[PDB]
Design a protein around this ligand. Structure first.
Ligand SMILES: NC(=O)c1ccc[n+]([C@@H]2O[C@H](COP(=O)([O-])OP(=O)(O)OC[C@H]3O[C@@H](n4cnc5c(N)ncnc54)[C@H](O)[C@@H]3O)[C@@H](O)[C@H]2O)c1
Ligand SMILES: NC(=O)c1ccc[n+]([C@@H]2O[C@H](COP(=O)([O-])OP(=O)(O)OC[C@H]3O[C@@H](n4cnc5c(N)ncnc54)[C@H](O)[C@@H]3O)[C@@H](O)[C@H]2O)c1
Ligand SMILES: NC(=O)c1ccc[n+]([C@@H]2O[C@H](COP(=O)([O-])OP(=O)(O)OC[C@H]3O[C@@H](n4cnc5c(N)ncnc54)[C@H](O)[C@@H]3O)[C@@H](O)[C@H]2O)c1
Ligand SMILES: NC(=O)c1ccc[n+]([C@@H]2O[C@H](COP(=O)([O-])OP(=O)(O)OC[C@H]3O[C@@H](n4cnc5c(N)ncnc54)[C@H](O)[C@@H]3O)[C@@H](O)[C@H]2O)c1
Lengths: 347, 347, 347, 347
């Protein structure tokens, strides 16, 4: 009893929608969310926006599902509105489609919750369900979805953590052994006040092979890669407008192919799935420093792995940048301007 | 061996200082930070600022130590400058004191890193050490420490996560069991796009006593409270200008004293140590619903625990607010407006 | 609704009781366990047994509660039989007492589950409740509780992990800084194929103070102590008849008193609560090892801390042993010899 | 310098070898272990033994690497002795092969550590390196490797946690939706005093999709499987002679093929890699009980999934057992006799 229904494109979902839904859910015993999609309209919206990746219907479903995880009276549905006139001219076919969708899903709504004053009479006259206006003057939040899509980094405090991955500009740094990748990633995450992701390969090697790579085999090489992804998902979930990644899947695929002689289908699937906004490739220019934790001191093998990284980066058609400064300070500076140019703010 | 020294009040530490220190540390083999303090001056600065809690010398040492955890060439020292003329009249006694401080600490600095163009000649002529200017035009960051102290919620992206606990306005919600504390805390953390801390008591009970409180004893009551603190430290470390706390130490003292007959010194020390900016107290207005897990379903026991909570809140002289609305939506609105008044954002 | 009741002192609980309870609970909607205790009888049983620590009524309640944590239809109660007639007269007063106890606890049992052939007719005669015999020939398990109490290390596979802490012979190793405690504890845990507990203080310092001890304060010194306990609870929960502990609460109390001038009530409460079967004290025979973390390089301070450890060990009247061999191999041999003697079983 | 070398096939490694190696490592600055292998001899040894799975050279390397993880002065190598007459007549070419291996690996041994009285003069004559006898009377451990291979469950306390996975008899239980297999796995782990592994799919669904499977996609179906393996590795690492597994990879393959319409190469690779000693198939005897979390309440879908499970089990040539008894107590009993027959220890 007392069923509440919220309609919305939710593209993207922001804290105004959250405030609306959580003001509505405290007033009803069960709240149903129905989000409609159209492939061409959503594709155009993504094209004209500043999102890093294009969401799919399951991805936006995941947004809404992760937002209300600890609220047990909220259900989520996705609806298809192909072959319909756009708003506000397709007010007849859309209503019939939504009525059929509710009939299929068994929903018997009693109240419709909305924050548009002109849309309420239209809802009442078509869907025949009484509507309740929540925050009609937009006192809690005044920012609109278009302003968020155009400039997300100025309204960063209104974007939930589940919606953040499609707005975070992820930076992947690649480099040879003992090239200073980890310290550079840490410094970049520090000055930018954001998160970072470490190379899961070293963690896996120590926590499963006692710290030696002699016992590494083909079947292991697909855990590492997948484990690496579990770090990336973390760094992008809590980033401050930018996240930094210590190593790509190109490097793990390269290690797998060079040691075991054959590729791995799931690492290639991850390569295809995971696309990075900016990729930075360091060089082997820095002289070798003896440490004691790695006996692979030969620079010929380093150059061979670097060249194989270049060719495998070209194989998947992945764009990257090269930094050639021997000194660490200049390389840090150049990475700073690269990130700042990626941000899109000029001098 | 190419020693670099940075001087600073660092009160509070912000991303401009971080950028300075990490531009300096990549250029030297070892960077020493010397932080001078004066009790009365720092007390006045805290009084005139908007910080939630007053930092101590160990607390700011902890700031600087947690910032550069993964940078292994940075050392931190604290120095006392009592009985010295303020800047810039005290350019002679301070220099002698700081020189004696390096003498006692064994530092032999070679370079001093600073971002003040006017201060460089005094450094050169007093300490006899060449100075290096880093970002003299403040291109990377232009915000000053005073602007952060006066209005920290507008420059929130420049405050590190180690310095954040002394700026986050922590809200503690108190209420009886099965009164809706958890859902309210979750909703407040959702609409405000911030973190929250759950009641560690339930977690401890399930993970150590099989989910029943019959096996609870006096010596257990000091684990729970301390464990509760480990949640609070998390919520304030990642908050979006405000953190929400599900239960205070007053409640665990209440349970301990009512079930065991005696208090516990450590949880009282925690009460003294942990001070909250806003405390909200709910009522027993909501009717009891049979759950099969609590035998104290009578409203008499609930009222007794509520009155004991009130008297123990008065015993420690802790101010709080009372919300009496039976409906959930009105209570949520009252909590929202209380938090908004606490924010202080004027119109 | 189809209520089953199981009686027993469960002192200690073993896998025969577990098998009986699982077989009973697979056949009833809810199973109630009622365990009776008598102070003098239980004290005598503990005295004549080989348990390391004496359980209390809450401790045995915790055993039974942690055993059936994921079985949601099992309840647990404790009953008092003081002022009781001597055996075998204890079949009439005990029946009245249990009937009354079930009266205030509201239980209305329908079946009594037992594994005694002769006790069943007396149960039927006194309690008036039909009894069901489970495994009357003891096919699944034949070992009795007395054999477990006398020799627990020969029937180690029948003792649950919740009951194990009162049978594990915990060994605590104490020694000066950089004396080799960690490697010795690891070797002892390796050759004995068991668990160990690391010093939580180092972990806390690195994970909360950036790895330096300057930011350590009085209020911190309690967390460390409690954290240390959380390691001990782990090591004893999975030990192979013996668990090894890297540091006692005497050392953390010593550090707190030396660096603060006052003790801590909760560390003293932990000292009183936590009693170790064997305590081993090492010497300062090995030369100090430079690491870069300690400014107290003088051996005078090391000897002062060692003497303070001795005096604080004597203050609470805690017995210990001294190992004085300079070489590591002989010290390992002496530790093995001491542990083997403390086992008490020669072959 | 003081280099020490230990020889042995370590097939399997037991606590006598650990005691030898850790008595030798305290006496030398660096210890080297060299495992010689022969494919046919090792295959015959595995055939005549009672191991559940056949180790490979990397697997035994992993044993030795994980055992001495926290001992930093131990290195591990593998050596090939193809075309060698067995001991003790192949004492001539074997010495030359080991000398060449020393030359390749750069080892310059100073002492050889062994526990054989007759081999010491032979070692001195051939390898020309002084030998040290450790525990020649086998006082600490007297059990031999052959006794462990023939009967591992009577010397279970001598098998390290790294070697245990190749001796644990893993049991995998398969059942329909809401068939109660988790409680059965828990009961079996309880009465056998061992570990178990839960279905990682439910955990992944709640922790990544808000608790609903609507947002499940093809690329997700490969994390779940991998995550499931991470549970299995745990359960077998701490098992008491037997580990219980809640779900196989056949079920996740079934779900992936049924919903997404296509298989996944990595889950098939896991199927090939992970072979279980006993597989138990639970059918749909128990009637479906409505809960509100699954809308496929019809038994037709359950029957279809069971039939697809059967055909995919037959496709991979995996043997299994069907338990059709309705009673939960009877099914628990039947699983008990199945596990006991697998144990092979009769009356
Ligand atoms: N011709 C058509 O195709 C048909 C025509 C009639 C219906 N519309 C449908 O109506 C649906 C509604 O789309 P939408 O534009 O409203 O999506 P939306 O995400 O922009 O809005 C979702 C809801 O949240 C409310 N809201 C937004 N910001 C708020 C804030 N700051 N505070 C409080 N509330 C706020 C909105 O008033 C709205 O009710 C569309 O999916 C669309 O399919 C389309
Ligand atoms: N008491 C006296 O008379 C004596 C006189 C001479 C020395 N001073 C001492 O010198 C110390 C210096 O303190 P402070 O006032 O510089 O504290 P501060 O935190 O404001 O400065 C810290 C350092 O960081 C630099 N910095 C600040 N913002 C920056 C930004 N956005 N980008 C780059 N760099 C930035 C500053 O130039 C400064 O060098 C004082 O603590 C004080 O003890 C005092
Ligand atoms: N003076 C008297 O009249 C008499 C004296 C002895 C018993 N006590 C009463 O009896 C109670 C204690 O009962 P208890 O002695 O049976 O406790 P118990 O722990 O020895 O046994 C508990 C239950 O587990 C069963 N069991 C034990 N081992 C088993 C195995 N290997 N397999 C299957 N089942 C197994 C036992 O048959 C028993 O039913 C006391 O609380 C007290 O109330 C009174
Ligand atoms: N090709 C062949 O068949 C044959 C030919 C030459 C000799 N072996 C070679 O020599 C080595 C074989 O050594 P192994 O058979 O002794 O392997 P092993 O696993 O049986 O023992 C390895 C070492 O551990 C010692 N040890 C075993 N149990 C002990 C205990 N309880 N306490 C203390 N020490 C204990 C042994 O004395 C031995 O030194 C291999 O490298 C192998 O290649 C092979």
């Amino acid at each position: 009893k007392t069923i509440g229904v919220v309609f919305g494109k939710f593209y993207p979902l922001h804290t105004g929608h959250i405030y609306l839904i959580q003001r509505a859910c405290s007033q009803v015993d069960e709240l149903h969310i129905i989000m409609g999609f159209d492939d061409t309209r959503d594709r155009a919206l993504f094209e004209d926006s500043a999102m890093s990746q294009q969401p799919t219907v399951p991805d936006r479903l995941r947004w809404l599902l992760q937002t209300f995880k600890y609220q047990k009276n909220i259900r989520i549905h996705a609806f298809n509105e192909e072959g319909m006139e756009p708003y506000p001219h397709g007010w007849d076919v859309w209503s019939n489609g939504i009525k059929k969708f509710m009939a299929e899903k068994g929903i018997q709504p009693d109240l419709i919750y909305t924050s548009e004053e002109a849309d309420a009479p239209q809802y009442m006259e078509h869907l025949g369900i009484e509507t309740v206006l929540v925050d009609p003057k937009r006192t809690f939040m005044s920012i609109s979805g278009a302003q968020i899509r155009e400039n997300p980094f100025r309204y960063w405090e209104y974007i939930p953590t589940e919606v953040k991955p499609f707005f975070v500009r992820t930076v992947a740094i690649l480099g040879g052994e003992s090239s200073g990748k980890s310290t550079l990633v840490n410094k970049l995450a520090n000055i930018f006040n954001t998160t970072s992701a470490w190379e899961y390969g070293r963690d896996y090697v120590f926590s499963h092979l006692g710290g030696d790579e002699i016992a590494l085999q083909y079947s292991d090489y697909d855990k590492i890669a997948l484990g690496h992804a579990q770090y990336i998902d973390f760094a992008v979930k809590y980033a401050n407008k930018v996240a930094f990644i210590d190593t790509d899947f190109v490097t793990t695929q390269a290690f797998c192919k060079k040691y075991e002689g054959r590729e791995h289908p799931f690492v290639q699937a991850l390569i295809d799935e995971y696309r990075f906004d900016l990729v930075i490739l360091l060089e082997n220019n820095t002289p070798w420093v003896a440490d004691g934790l790695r006996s692979l001191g030969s620079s010929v093998d380093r150059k061979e792995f670097q060249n194989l990284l270049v060719e495998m980066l070209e194989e998947n058609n992945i764009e990257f940048v090269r930094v050639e400064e021997e000194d660490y300070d200049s390389r840090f500076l150049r990475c700073v301007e690269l990130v700042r140019e990626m941000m899109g703010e000029q001098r």
